[PDB]
Design a protein around this nucleic acid. Structure first.
Ligand SMILES: [Mg+2]
Ligand SMILES: [Mg+2]
Ligand SMILES: [Mg+2]
Ligand SMILES: [Mg+2]
Ligand SMILES: [Mg+2]
Ligand SMILES: [Mg+2]
Ligand SMILES: [Mg+2]
Ligand SMILES: [Mg+2]
Ligand SMILES: [Mg+2]
Ligand SMILES: [Mg+2]
Ligand SMILES: [Mg+2]
Ligand SMILES: [Mg+2]
Ligand SMILES: [Mg+2]
Ligand SMILES: [Mg+2]
Ligand SMILES: [Mg+2]
Ligand SMILES: [Mg+2]
Ligand SMILES: [Mg+2]
Ligand SMILES: [Mg+2]
Ligand SMILES: [Mg+2]
Ligand SMILES: [Mg+2]
Ligand SMILES: [Mg+2]
Ligand SMILES: [Mg+2]
Ligand SMILES: [Mg+2]
Ligand SMILES: [Mg+2]
Ligand SMILES: [Mg+2]
Ligand SMILES: [Mg+2]
Ligand SMILES: [Mg+2]
Ligand SMILES: [Mg+2]
Ligand SMILES: [Mg+2]
Ligand SMILES: [Mg+2]
Ligand SMILES: [Mg+2]
Ligand SMILES: [Mg+2]
Ligand SMILES: [Mg+2]
Ligand SMILES: [Mg+2]
Ligand SMILES: [Mg+2]
Ligand SMILES: [Mg+2]
Lengths: 156, 208, 225
RNA sequence: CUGCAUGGCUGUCGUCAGCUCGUGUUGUGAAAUGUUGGGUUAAGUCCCGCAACGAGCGCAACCCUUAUCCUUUGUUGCCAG
RNA sequence: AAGGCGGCCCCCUGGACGAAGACUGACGCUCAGGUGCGAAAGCGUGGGGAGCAAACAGGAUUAGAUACCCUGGUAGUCCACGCCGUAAACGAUGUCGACUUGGAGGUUGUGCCCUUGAGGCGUGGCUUCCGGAGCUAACGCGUUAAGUCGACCGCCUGGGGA
RNA sequence: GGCGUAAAGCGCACGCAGGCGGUUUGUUAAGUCAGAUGUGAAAUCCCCGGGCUCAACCUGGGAACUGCAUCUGAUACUGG
């Protein structure tokens, strides 16, 4: 029931006395079709072990995102280390207008109508961290109503 | 160019010879040629049979070939049909009266020559070598081996650059002399070349 | 259940000096005597009783409790408290990943059991006597480290720690695993990773025995209840 | 003919004491820890300490031979009485 | 203010800080262009010239040695008055102001307690080190910010070519 | 968008023009905000429709033309 997407695989290296040792890294993201999203980053000498370590870490360290019906709640921004990221709630059925890693993370996030833009570095690890930070700090009308101590109708 | 053959190094301690006879120097190499020709013949005939170890013993000028195989039904056929067919040609080669016994190989997943020939047959019918090495290790560690190491070599997937790969599960002490390491090696003659397969299986230490 | 002059007699209000203190302990320090901060026992008592109330809730319903102190002064006291309330203890070094890598530590719980089986009941006489001494000092070391949790089987449900920095690793592993933390937080410690902060001294053997006997009490009372 | 298409086998650094993995943790990451430190050893040998806990290939031993003794059997070997 | 400033004495002189009060009453901040200061080396005129020392000379070294090493040694270094107007002129961090957990010092004032000792409790200026949140590509910075903000100025836009 | 180290803080400072400006009251209404009028050619773009067998196309009405001027007001902020 948790849909799982790998974003990108990459071969890294490590130079030793014998020569170059190659390894593989895997960036996977999981989600429940709702606000529960979580990513993982595994690494091994072999690709199925790296995707399995990534899905293993992604199934835990899940994060909860207060969605609306199928879209966001307010235009939110997210940063991590190279990637300022803008995302915006959109009308019904305009699709996921997003780049690379953000399409996979919002698709398993269960969003369906976004207008996104990734500025800066588009490294999938940091931009998926920047989207996780943006969706995590996106706040609902209930949370702001309980916070300000007013009703939702007093907030409009 | 580094490692000794683990059978030949274990031959005085925990492993038996595959030929246990005696002769003087006059009839030594003639008996050893007759043993070579009969192991050649029996391997070509029982190629589809999962034969592992042909033991030859000759008392009183009468050869006795003990075939170890995982299934004796295809080696025998009808009761004394194919065994008798192979017996009359063994007696033709050795020039002496023959006798054929068949020892069944319990657990064919724990015999290095059978695993190596299954991998070779799989590579010949073009399967992925990593899948074959995985299934050989998972089957052997499930069947109860204390440790297996497999290794293929050369022209993998038709690549022009030959490389080697090896998997290992469990402990395989080659330097331990009392370790029961079943070691054997097969060769796959693909259209891109020759792929060499080695397999070590550690069952445990004999406490003699 | 413990009065303020009870704490003042045991030495709970003592702490560390003014050049070792954490600025997060500002809402817990009463004053500063002899260039040493003084812990506000006015806020110590109702927080220690809130912790003992939640301890009485979990040990009422048979939650698993792990007592953690390896100060080489409260090691026997935390052992006697965990064997009083038949709970689990860590008196010698907290192994890195004792909770998170439980599935690896389990294979040494099993090794400690099989060595105890072999030697006491198993009578594992008749070995190579040099191996009989390597088995002996292995089993002594494993009992000295993992003997307090050898019957636990699973993850504990609450962790009571005597010092948040001598045992800061167990705080992080509990914070990862979602296990609640009850801790005697001194002036030189960080009160953020601890879910139930208890101000008080950490090196005083009388105060450690007061804390532990009050916890082994409200657990035995919740078990019997 | 091609060892620069390969198997197998062999040299070599080097019988040097090293090389790695699993889970965990740290770091955006390449990676790191473990494997480092205090001693010690022929040895990543062992002990203690330690966010590591464990495990594998190797380091050692198990093999052969020599060095002392015992029992058994004494020819084609032996000669104390 | 920066460059920079090191025996002692006198003369002239600028700035900083502290303590109580008194006073003026926003008189303030920044600054293109502009003006002024601005290490060493260098230039001009006039002196001076011990030591050091570019250049140069000789000796070695070296395959060579227009170098390092050695023995010498001239401008220069010094003074007066002018010019030049540059440095890795660096904290490689523009100036002014406000707020934001701490610790150990150094220096320089000053208040109080019986200074019952050179102590005890504070309150200002400047300064060094470590380090938390936060920030940062990381290194690291971290109340003297490279944190959070405001005002103004200067500058950048791939590497050479330059 | 940046300027410790990747390009980038003038060597430092004073300072004219310029930019900015503590707090209180009163007043002004310049900026600002609201409304009205005039204008902002038509076409074009957009919306709702109509017509060519449909569409392209043609076309009706509207909105829009984010602007400027004048007048009537408002006085929090900035300015005087
Ligand atoms: Mg990680
Ligand atoms: Mg870019
Ligand atoms: Mg060799
Ligand atoms: Mg070659
Ligand atoms: Mg070869
Ligand atoms: Mg690891
Ligand atoms: Mg190493
Ligand atoms: Mg060491
Ligand atoms: Mg070892
Ligand atoms: Mg060895
Ligand atoms: Mg006045
Ligand atoms: Mg200027
Ligand atoms: Mg000069
Ligand atoms: Mg001159
Ligand atoms: Mg002159
Ligand atoms: Mg002179
Ligand atoms: Mg000279
Ligand atoms: Mg310059
Ligand atoms: Mg400097
Ligand atoms: Mg500069
Ligand atoms: Mg200025
Ligand atoms: Mg610092
Ligand atoms: Mg900033
Ligand atoms: Mg700043
Ligand atoms: Mg910066
Ligand atoms: Mg830029
Ligand atoms: Mg540079
Ligand atoms: Mg630069
Ligand atoms: Mg500067
Ligand atoms: Mg004003
Ligand atoms: Mg006004
Ligand atoms: Mg007006
Ligand atoms: Mg208007
Ligand atoms: Mg028009
Ligand atoms: Mg129509
Ligand atoms: Mg006014």
């Amino acid at each position: 029931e948790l849909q799982e997407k790998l974003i990108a695989v990459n071969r890294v290296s490590k130079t030793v006395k014998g020569g170059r040792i190659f390894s593989f890294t895997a960036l996977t993201v999981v989600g429940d079709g709702n606000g529960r999203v979580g990513f993982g980053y595994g690494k091994a000498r072999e690709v199925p072990a790296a995707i399995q370590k990534a899905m293993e870490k992604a199934r835990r360290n899940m994060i909860n995102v207060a969605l609306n019906n199928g879209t966001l709640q307010h235009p939110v921004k997210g940063v991590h280390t190279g990637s300022r990221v803008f995302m915006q709630p959109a009308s019904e059925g305009t699709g996921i207008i997003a780049g690379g890693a953000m399409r996979a993370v919002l698709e398993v996030a269960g969003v369906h109508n976004v207008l996104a833009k990734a500025y800066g570095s588009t490294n999938p690890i940091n931009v998926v961290r920047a989207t996780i930070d943006g969706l995590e700090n996106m706040n609902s009308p209930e949370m702001v109503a309980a916070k300000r101590g007013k009703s939702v109708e007093e907030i409009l | 160019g580094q490692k000794v053959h683990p059978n030949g190094i274990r031959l005085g301690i925990v492993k038996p010879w595959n030929s246990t006879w005696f002769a003087n120097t006059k009839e030594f190499a003639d008996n050893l040629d007759s043993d070579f020709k009969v192991r050649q013949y029996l391997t070509k005939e029982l190629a589809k049979a999962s034969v592992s170890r042909i033991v030859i013993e000759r008392p009183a000028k009468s050869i006795r070939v003990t075939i170890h195989t995982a299934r004796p039904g295809i080696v025998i056929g009808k009761k004394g049909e194919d065994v008798e067919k192979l017996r009359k040609v063994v007696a033709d080669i050795a020039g002496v009266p023959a006798q054929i016994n068949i020892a069944e190989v319990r657990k064919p997943e724990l015999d290095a020559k059978l695993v190596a020939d299954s991998i070779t047959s799989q590579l010949e019918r073009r399967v992925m070598f990593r899948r074959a090495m995985k299934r050989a290790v998972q089957n052997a560690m499930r069947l109860g081996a204390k440790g297996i190491k497999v290794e293929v070599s050369g022209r993998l997937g038709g690549a022009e650059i030959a490389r080697t790969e090896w998997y290992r599960e469990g402990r395989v002490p080659l330097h331990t002399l009392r370790a029961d390491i079943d070691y054997n090696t097969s060769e796959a003659h693909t259209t891109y070349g020759v792929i060499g397969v080695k397999v070590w299986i550690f069952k445990g230490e004999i406490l003699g | 259940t413990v009065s303020m002059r009870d704490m003042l007699k045991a030495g709970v209000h003592f702490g560390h000096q003014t050049r070792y203190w954490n600025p997060k302990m500002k809402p817990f320090i009463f004053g500063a005597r002899n260039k040493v901060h003084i812990i506000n026992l006015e806020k110590t008592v109702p927080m220690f009783n809130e912790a003992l109330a939640e301890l009485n809730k979990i040990a009422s319903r048979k939650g698993k409790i792990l007592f953690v102190g390896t100060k080489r002064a409260a090691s026997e006291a935390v052992k006697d408290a965990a064997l009083s309330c038949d709970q689990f203890f860590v008196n010698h070094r907290w192994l890195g990943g004792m909770l998170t890598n439980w599935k690896t530590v389990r294979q040494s719980i099993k090794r400690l059991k099989d060595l105890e089986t072999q030697s006491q009941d198993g009578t594992f006489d008749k070995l190579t006597k040099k191996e009989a001494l390597m088995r002996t000092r292995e089993l002594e070391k494993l009992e000295n480290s993992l003997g307090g949790i050898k019957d636990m089987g699973g993850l504990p449900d609450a962790l009571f720690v005597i010092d948040a920095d001598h045992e800061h690793i167990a705080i992080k592993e509990a914070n990862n695993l979602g296990i609640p933390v009850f801790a005697i937080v001194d002036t030189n410690s960080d009160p953020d990773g601890v879910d139930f902060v208890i101000p008080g001294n950490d090196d005083a053997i009388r105060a450690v025995t007061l804390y532990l006997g009050a916890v082994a009490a409200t657990v035995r009372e919740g078990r019997s209840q």
